Design a binder for this molecule. Structure first.
Ligand SMILES: [Zn+2]
Ligand SMILES: [Zn+2]
Ligand SMILES: [Zn+2]
Length: 136
């Protein structure tokens, strides 16, 4: 269900096919009317705390959303552990994959699923793990 995804999450691993954050805060997902989602997080890049607020608009395809006014498409895929999910972002023109989990602790089996996902989508395996912090 959509409501299940609401609440706090941690950005645990990132990769791009083609601005590495030196620090990331937890991510909050809020379920808006109509099944749409709001994603809020803060990132420290170049010594500056930059807030990031995204609206993911539900589409006719489940687990598929659009953001930046249709400029980007975002897919949300589960893993074998109930509290970790894969976000796959594509559009304007780069690709990005993120592992998100409900806790910030290292998780081997979610990481194994993430690497398998990266292989199926043709990313490399040079994964980046941002440093975690409650406040920016
Ligand atoms: Zn957990
Ligand atoms: Zn495994
Ligand atoms: Zn294992």
């Amino acid at each position: 269900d959509t409501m299940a995804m609401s609440g706090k999450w941690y950005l645990k691993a990132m990769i791009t096919d083609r601005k590495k954050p030196e620090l990331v805060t937890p991510m909050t997902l809020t379920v808006l009317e109509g099944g749409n989602l709001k994603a809020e997080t803060t990132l420290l890049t170049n010594g500056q705390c930059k807030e990031v607020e995204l609206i993911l608009e539900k589409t006719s395809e489940p687990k598929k959303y659009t953001t930046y006014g249709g400029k980007r498409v975002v897919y949300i895929e589960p893993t074998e552990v109930k509290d970790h999910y894969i976000f796959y972002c594509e559009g304007e023109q780069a690709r990005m994959a993120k592992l998100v989990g409900r806790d910030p602790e290292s998780n081997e089996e979610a990481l194994e699923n993430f690497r398998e996902f990266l292989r199926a989508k043709g990313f490399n395996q040079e994964i980046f793990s941002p440093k975690q912090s409650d406040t920016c």
